[PDB]
Amino acid sequence: GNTVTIDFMSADGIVPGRTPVRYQGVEVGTVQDISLSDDLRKIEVKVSIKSDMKDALREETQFWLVTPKASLAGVSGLDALVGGNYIGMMPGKGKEQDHFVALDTQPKYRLDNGDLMIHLQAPDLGSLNSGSLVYFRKIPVGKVYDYAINPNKQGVVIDVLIERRFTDLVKKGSRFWNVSGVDANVSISGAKVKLESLAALVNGAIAFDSPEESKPAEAEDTFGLYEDLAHSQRGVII
Amino acid sequence: GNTVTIDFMSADGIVPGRTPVRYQGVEVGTVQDISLSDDLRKIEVKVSIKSDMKDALREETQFWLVTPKASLAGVSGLDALVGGNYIGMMPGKGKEQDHFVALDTQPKYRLDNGDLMIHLQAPDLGSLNSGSLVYFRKIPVGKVYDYAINPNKQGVVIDVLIERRFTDLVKKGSRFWNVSGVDANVSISGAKVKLESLAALVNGAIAFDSPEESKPAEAEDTFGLYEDLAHSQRGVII
């Protein structure tokens, strides 16, 4: 039980009743008070944090609001059935500090749990949301972690998070393609409209290939994200 | 705890149990009583407001009822799962005052948080609702704030709210187009009906372009809203 003041832009979905401070999925703190400062829309949020985190609470502690995903229940308007909001934290060395400025978005993936953290560069985001799924042989082996525009305005950088035991699958010669939405074709002598993947329709997905003999890629190696399985076929440009 | 009387047109969704007064998303007041005056359908609503806002409570304080969005759950009839109503406020200089006349709609965006507030002029509103989303490279970088008919009856003025860190994206030569609903085409040698964006189907969306070398637009610069991506192609009129 302490008092920590965090300044936000917009106080949406922050209730003193149930708004936890989930450090790595662990309910550490609880929002106590929401007060306003009229200058430049400053919103002072008082937070009570437990004892062991208070010894870890230092100046380079980054706070950011976490909302639920862009889902089918969120776009339909069923606002009572989706879930609740929380705020997240990551402490650093810093200094002793009480007054914090909140962050605009989620920070970069820093921890090393054995997982693989590689970047994909696409000309646009596509149907991919944060939390869309990564497949190998139609088996979920990871997820999309974040997405951000690169400093040149041409591209979108999509960085994914392969699971720890599946790190051997990603190679230097792996190709990532996009499997999202439904495509229905009207073809001659029969028109095969076949519905294979149901989870890719609502949220989107990324599949990839693993070549036979290549070194395993690691440590933020970039990859091109093709828009289709037919665009990711190997071969010789002529 | 005070007493503030506000006169409304229709008392729909205003309960003494749970009807907050959300000033910038902060629960400041709570509706206490709803009484009626029979002349011209006057509805006297008594509101208890906290102490610090009472010192800020002055005559040019604009009250307006806020309802949830036009959503798929609101048109289906699931009235228990959508949410609740509230009223909003914005105080001004004015004078000391207790008796208020409510407003018909949301006031104009006044605060300067660093966000960009530009106007779009379309011949009709389209599938856009208040709260529909703004995309750049299929990344949500803003939202539609309000919509209003211009004084000539030809057009609809749609003013959007780009986020603070994405203000650099909007240029003077940016083009805004409308991506809303589903369009299915039957074409020769195959008919590619591809479903890309799921959030644009229910509520609607606006995407835009960023040209390479142009000055960044600012401060309520107008823009034309094209009805399609094919209508917003650059080129020379011949």
UniProtKB/Swiss-Prot annotation, chains A, B:
Which gene is annotated as encoding this protein in its UniProt record? letB
State start and end of the fragment within the whole protein: 46 to 283 of 877
Its main localization is membrane
Name of the featured protein:
Lipophilic envelope-spanning tunnel protein B
Q: Where is this region: MCE/MlaD 1?
A: 1-104
Q: Which BP terms does GO give this entry? A: intermembrane lipid transfer; membrane organization
Region named MCE/MlaD 2: 115-227
**Effect ascribed to mutating residue 78 to N:** Loss of activity
Query: What induces or represses expression of this protein, per its UniProt record?
Result: Induced by a defect in lipopolysaccharide molecules.
Identify the keywords attached in UniProt to this record, alphabetized: Cell inner membrane, Cell membrane, Lipid transport, Membrane, Repeat, Transmembrane, Transmembrane helix, Transport
Q: What happens when the gene is disrupted?
A: The letAB mutant is not sensitive to lauryl sulfobetaine (LSB), but the pqiAB-letAB double mutant is more sensitive to LSB than the pqiAB mutant. Double mutation also increases sensitivity of the pqiAB mutant to caprylyl sulfobetaine.
Q: Its function? A: Forms a tunnel that spans the entire periplasmic space. Is probably involved in the transport of lipids between the inner membrane and the outer membrane through the tunnel. Forms a dynamic tunnel sufficiently long to mediate lipid transport directly between the two membranes without the need for a shuttle protein. Binds phospholipids. Lipids bind inside the tunnel. Required for outer membrane homeostasis. Contributes to membrane integrity.
Q: How does it assemble?
A: Homohexamer. May interact with LetA in the inner membrane. May also interact with partners in the outer membrane.
GO CC annotations on file: outer membrane-bounded periplasmic space; plasma membrane
A GO molecular-function descriptor: identical protein binding
Q: Which family does it belong to?
A: Belongs to the PqiB family.
Outcome of mutating residue 82 to N, per the record?
Loss of activity
The free-text domain note is:
The seven MCE (Mammalian Cell Entry) domains of a single protomer of LetB resemble seven beads on a string. Six copies of this linearly configured protomer associate laterally to form a homohexameric assembly. The LetB hexamers form an elongated tube consisting of seven stacked MCE rings, each formed from the association of six identical MCE domains, with a central tunnel. Rings 1, 5, 6 and 7 are dynamic and adopt open and closed states.
Q: Where in the cell is it found?
A: Cell inner membrane
Q: Does Transmembrane helix count among this protein's keywords?
A: yes
